[PDB]
């Protein structure tokens, strides 16, 4: 329901949703994203895909990171934009047509 945009993405969180897209797309095997996002042949790590796509979009942000010696604001790749931008493409059909409930047809 969140993936198709029926519910507001804020409360669920794009980051958590972004993972579900990778799992579903990988399970389905429709590796459309790799062509649209030139990252690698295939991947199933949510962290890995988010890292590279941010570089592709040249998106970065400054995020506070907790460390033993204090709190330091250190520039970091903009993971959030990757989730949001990645999500938008899926619903715009760039990745490809999918059947979220493909498992249930056998019933």
């Amino acid at each position: 329901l969140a993936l198709c945009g029926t519910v507001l993405d804020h409360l669920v969180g794009e980051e958590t949703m972004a993972d579900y897209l990778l799992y579903t797309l990988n399970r389905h095997g429709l590796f459309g994203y790799v062509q649209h996002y030139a990252l690698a042949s295939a991947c199933d790590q949510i962290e890995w895909v988010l890292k590279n796509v941010a570089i592709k979009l040249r998106k970065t942000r400054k995020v506070k990171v907790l460390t033993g010696t204090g709190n330091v604001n250190v520039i970091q790749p903009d993971y959030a934009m990757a989730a949001r931008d990645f999500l938008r493409t899926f619903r715009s059909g760039l990745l490809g047509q999918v059947m979220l409930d493909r498992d249930i047809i056998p019933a």
Partner: protein, 115 residues
């Protein structure tokens, strides 16, 4: 003074929380009659779309004399049954947890260092 919404450091080795990615875990609930939680006080922590109970082992607020004040708010993830999630705790843990009212011996066994 750990309260609601505080970003906290999971000083542990649990794969769920110890891995360095995602936003720092935020405190949702403090198991005290007062909101403020200090060393040895349990708190409810939200991690990666999940609610996990944790235990405070250090904080940045000044304490009573002869007590260790850390430079970051440290917390340890604890299962519901009380067994700690992580198998090891290498960063020093204050020894006051032994005499504080509650069950802390399990954490002390896991924590090799002591300050």
């Amino acid at each position: 003074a750990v309260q609601k919404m505080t970003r906290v450091r999971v000083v542990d080795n649990s794969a769920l929380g110890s891995t360095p990615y995602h936003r720092p875990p935020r405190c949702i609930h403090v198991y005290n009659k007062s909101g403020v939680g200090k060393v040895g006080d349990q708190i409810l922590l939200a991690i990666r779309g999940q609610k996990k109970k944790a235990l405070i082992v250090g904080h940045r607020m000044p304490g009573s004399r002869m007590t260790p004040k850390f430079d970051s708010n440290n917390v340890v993830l604890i299962e519901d049954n009380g067994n700690p999630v992580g198998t090891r705790i290498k960063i020093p843990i204050p020894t006051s947890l032994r005499r504080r009212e509650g069950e802390y011996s399990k954490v002390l066994a896991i924590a090799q260092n002591f300050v």
